[PDB]
Amino acid sequence: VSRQRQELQELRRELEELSVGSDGVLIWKIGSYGRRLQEAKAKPNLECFSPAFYTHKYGYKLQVSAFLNGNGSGEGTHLSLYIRVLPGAFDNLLEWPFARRVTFSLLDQSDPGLAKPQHVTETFHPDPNWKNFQKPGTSLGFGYPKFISHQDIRKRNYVRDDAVFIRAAVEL
Amino acid sequence: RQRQELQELRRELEELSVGSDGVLIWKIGSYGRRLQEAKAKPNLECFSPAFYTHKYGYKLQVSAFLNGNGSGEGTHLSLYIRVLPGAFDNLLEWPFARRVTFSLLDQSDPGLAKPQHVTETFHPDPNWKNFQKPGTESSLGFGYPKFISHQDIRKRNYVRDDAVFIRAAVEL
Amino acid sequence: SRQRQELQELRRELEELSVGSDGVLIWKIGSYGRRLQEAKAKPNLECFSPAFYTHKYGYKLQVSAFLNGNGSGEGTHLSLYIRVLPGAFDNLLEWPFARRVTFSLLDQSDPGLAKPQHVTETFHPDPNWKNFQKPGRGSLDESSLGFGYPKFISHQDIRKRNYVRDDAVFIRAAVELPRKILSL
Ligand SMILES: [Cl-]
Ligand SMILES: [Cl-]
Ligand SMILES: [Cl-]
């Protein structure tokens, strides 16, 4: 029994090391949007987390997070989006502070052949003085409290089939 | 209980099945045994792992009747493809209209002699219901009931070490 | 047993997903100090990288290391080797394996503040080395195959710079990939 469980834990860890951006891109699907939005309205600062992902194979380990009902200046009125640098297996091989351009998008879920998608996008340029980007060891989220308002999110296909797509594109 | 813990990992592995520059290579092992099973069970269809054409692309699945079906029954290998519901469907153009190239690979040492692959190409038919957006008649896929005859498959190295390779290249 | 069979099937599926990143495998060897002491006590003690495909539908390779050395490097050097393993796509490939291989022991220094001085060896696989031949049966069944460097880096040199950092070493194997085609 102990062997089968240690085996499952080993495979789960292996799967997590396979979470890697595609040309620096992570697309995070937040399902059950309708329910999760009501949970966030009942509990201020309830945060959703993406799976951890490597920017590129043997790169930085990052994690996207979202407040469906918002946080800080966006609390109760906006979707808020953040990213964090996590301790990664290959940190000693990397340049510090983390200084890669990060592009956040909330995807417009429209068929591109029928209508041009109108994604909500913002490009983050890390400040080398912010502690957030320093080598882990030697949370620290960085992002936007007012990414998209509750009124604006209903104006395009940002929510479709009770799901939203958050895109984080890291310049490699 | 653990059947679903294992099914969670199996589902994640399926999400990691992605074409290499739009290419899926599907190995059908135990050819002799499976061919005999196909002769005894005419509705016996082999399925490839499901795969994404590209990261965040269309989810497809290749299938084969080793003893053939329809007009190829008992005389040919029949090859088909289907669109399956994918996690990113709302981001894609519909109907699926990307050129698909099927090849049965000649397993000849390329350093010795030029392998003579058996190849067919098609542009997906917009009137084929399965090429339309999933969720929006026969359960059969789209393809070739007469891909290669049983006489031709025994020539060259189409069957080698009791295995055949099916290649499906999707124009990205 | 049914769940145990399922675990081994998933483990095989995960191995098929071990693919180099643009032909690159980076292998982290943790607990370096302890493993060096174990290797001093057991001369044949060999560390193995996970098996990996050079590229999707490519060659299956595996890197190996003797922390206390093998052959001419025994007791004085780290020895590095690579071998071809039976892969699912072997019958579609050119044999013998002839793609350029570059081995590196990584100097774990921040590249932005100091130039890391990696220890490197490059080679064009010799067509006469039995391992680089197509994998696969005779009455003689042994494991002596892999080509390499018995004297990759000396024990004196590995203690310089940042080759060992946080009790770990990084071994890099970069393999030459098929060239992309372009129509003019
Ligand atoms: Cl730092
Ligand atoms: Cl995908
Ligand atoms: Cl150390």
Chain A residues in contact with B90 (beta carbon < 8 A): 109, 157, 160-161, 163, 165
- Which residues line ion ligand 1, judged by CB < 5 Å? A 96-97, 134-135
Contact A61, A52 (CB under 8 A): yes
DSSP secondary structure string for all residues of C121-152: EEE---TTSGGGSPP---S-------EEEEEE
Chain C: partners with 3+ C-beta pairs within 8 Å: A, B
Nearest chain B alpha carbon to A162: B90
Q: Is B39 helix (H, G, I), strand (E, B) or coil?
A: helix
Burial zone of C65 (CB within 10 Å; 0-12 exposed, 13-18 middle, 19+ buried): buried
Number of domains in chain B: 1
Contact yes or no for A58 and C112 at CB 8 A: no
Element (H, E) at B153: helix B150-153
What is the rounded distance in angstroms from the CA atom of residue B140 to the CA atom of residue B127? 15
Q: Is B43 helix (H, G, I), strand (E, B) or coil?
A: coil
Residue C98: CATH number of its domain: 2.60.210.10
What is the rounded distance in angstroms from the CA atom of residue B76 to the CA atom of residue A153? 53
What is the rounded distance in angstroms from the CA atom of residue B163 to the CA atom of residue C95? 19
Contact yes or no for A15 and B9 at CB 8 A: yes
Chain C residues in contact with B105 (beta carbon < 8 A): 92
Q: For residue C71, what is the DSSP state?
A: G
- Between the two ends of chain C, the Cα-to-Cα distance in Å is 57
Nearest CA-CA distance, residue C53 and chain A, Å: 14
What is the rounded distance in angstroms from the CA atom of residue C64 to the CA atom of residue C37? 17
Nearest CA-CA distance, residue A110 and chain B, Å: 6
What is the rounded distance in angstroms from the CA atom of residue C63 to the CA atom of residue C49? 5
Token pair for residue A134?
A: 């320093």
Contact C70, C139 (CB under 8 A): no
What resolution in Å is listed for this PDB structure?
A: 1.8
Q: For residue B33, what is the DSSP state?
A: H
Residue with tokens 């340049």: A95
Residues just before a chain gap in chain A (C–N exceeding 2.5 Å) are 138
What is the rounded distance in angstroms from the CA atom of residue A65 to the CA atom of residue A68? 10
For every residue of chain A, which 3-state class applies, written as one string?
A: CHHHHHHHHHHHHHHHHCCECECCEEEEEECCHHHHHHHHHHCCCCCEECCCEECCCCCCEEEEEEECCCCHHHCCCEEEEEEEEECCCCHHHCCCCCCCCEEEEECCCCCCCCCCCCCEEEEECCCCCCHHHCCCCCCCCEEEEEEEECCHHHCCCCCECCEEEEEEEECC
Q: Is B27 helix (H, G, I), strand (E, B) or coil?
A: strand
What is the rounded distance in angstroms from the CA atom of residue C169 to the CA atom of residue A93? 11
Backbone angles phi, psi at A29, to 5 degrees: -90, 120
CA distance readout (Å), C91 to B111, C128, C143? 11, 20, 22
Method: X-ray
Which has the closest alpha carbon to C103: C116, C121, C91, C86? C121
Print the domain residue range for C125. Answer: 1-184
Contact yes or no for B94 and A111 at CB 8 A: yes
What is the rounded distance in angstroms from the CA atom of residue C126 to the CA atom of residue C130? 9
DSSP secondary structure string for all residues of C4-47: HHHHHHHHHHHHHT-B-BTTEEEEEE--HHHHHHHHHHSTT--E
> How far is ligand 1, taken at its centre, from the CA of residue A132, in Å?
9
Backbone angles phi, psi at B36, to 5 degrees: -60, -40
Q: Does C112 touch chain A (CB under 8 A)?
A: yes
Respond yes or no on whether the N-terminal peptide bond of residue B95 is cis (omega within 30° of 0).
Answer: yes
